[PDB]
Amino acid sequence: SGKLRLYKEKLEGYNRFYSIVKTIKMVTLAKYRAAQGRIRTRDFSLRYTELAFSKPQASRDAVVAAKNALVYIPITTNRGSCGALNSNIVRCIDSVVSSKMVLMPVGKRGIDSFSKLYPDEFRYGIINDMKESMHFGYATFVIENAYEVSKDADRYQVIFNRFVSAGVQRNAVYNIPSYEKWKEDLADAASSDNQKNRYLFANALQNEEEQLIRDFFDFHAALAVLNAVGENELSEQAARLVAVEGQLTNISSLQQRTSSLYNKTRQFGITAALIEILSAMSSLEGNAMKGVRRNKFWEG
């Protein structure tokens, strides 16, 4: 019948969907493994960047104290199906809502998510085609656009995803204060006994010219952005596997349910057709009447 064929076609479509999603899983795992090589080569580029910018600070004074623009550069993926990374980044941004907040998100999903939720705190976003390797030029472009968005900005907060392991993708932050505040903190560390761990570093920077210091600042900011985007890409690939596995499980459940419905429907259809035919036959038989028998009844 038609309903039986309807379920058959639906099951075939689900099978095609499952095959396509499995191919997507294989492709994503290929890049996960292919760009898994970063793990061996990471965690050593940013060593003096820590001294430049690593500071244990409260989450309130740094926010309320500033009265100039607070730039935020959330990292977001171009394609969906990554998982909860973008949602968590949006939640983190929402928790830090302020009149000084300015957004220059990254990725199509980030743009489409921050444009509607935050129309008056959104200027424009950056997009990279995932064709080449995440390189320094991309980070420089992001930094230049961030400066042009708000040059008199108190800080530039980069929010990205740190890929701790195949199944752990936390949210990490890089804070990049303004040149003036960084200079003040550097001078305080160099002179005062406080910040004893940066004393040598600050004094070394002071001895040099100012152009070199500015170049150092820009260079290490770009390195931090490069690290953020790389970790976000790796987390996206991994995070993407979880979503693809979830989609595969959902598709398998749908296939099982449709197959059960198909079997049940075909059995019911066969039974109904047979019952209808037998009912017609019984109706025909009932109308038949046995006439008088013309036989020699006495001859017995």
Partner: protein, 146 residues
């Protein structure tokens, strides 16, 4: 089944599976000698350097023509595709036999070399509005000719 939505990898199993699928296309039944010889040639990798589009033309030249005789290079004594009575010798003696294996390989190697040198080279250099149509018609005709 694992490369529907991604660029395929041209490994030996695929390079020969494509030709095998291409060879199964036919309109009329094939004589045993022709079919078995073509399958053997595709099985040993003699069609690795032949494009999937020209497989039918290659098979037609192998069956209904003889490149070695055309260019005066054939050295085989008896194993020629125009000797239709070799079918029963092949049936009695498998292609993987010393009686026929040597000359079979020699003929296949020579035919592949001559084809790649003369025909496919010109095919890849077709740049015109009428030559392209002529080549397309030739390929379609060879598709249903063998």
């Amino acid at each position: 089944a694992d490369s529907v939505g991604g660029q395929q990898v041209q490994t030996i199993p695929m390079i020969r599976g494509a030709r095998f699928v291409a060879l199964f296309n036919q309109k009329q039944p094939s004589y045993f000698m022709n079919a078995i010889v073509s399958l053997y040639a595709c099985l040993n990798g003699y069609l690795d350097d032949v494009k999937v589009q020209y497989v039918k033309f290659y098979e037609y030249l192998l069956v209904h023509r003889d490149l070695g005789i055309m260019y005066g290079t054939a050295k085989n004594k008896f194993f020629y595709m125009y000797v239709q009575e070799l079918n029963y010798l092949i049936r009695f003696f498998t292609l993987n036999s010393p009686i026929l294996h040597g000359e079979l390989e020699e003929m296949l190697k020579q035919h592949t070399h001559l084809f790649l040198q003369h025909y496919q080279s010109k095919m890849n250099a077709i740049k015109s509005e009428k030559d392209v149509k002529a080549l397309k018609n030739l390929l379609y005709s060879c598709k249903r000719a063998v």
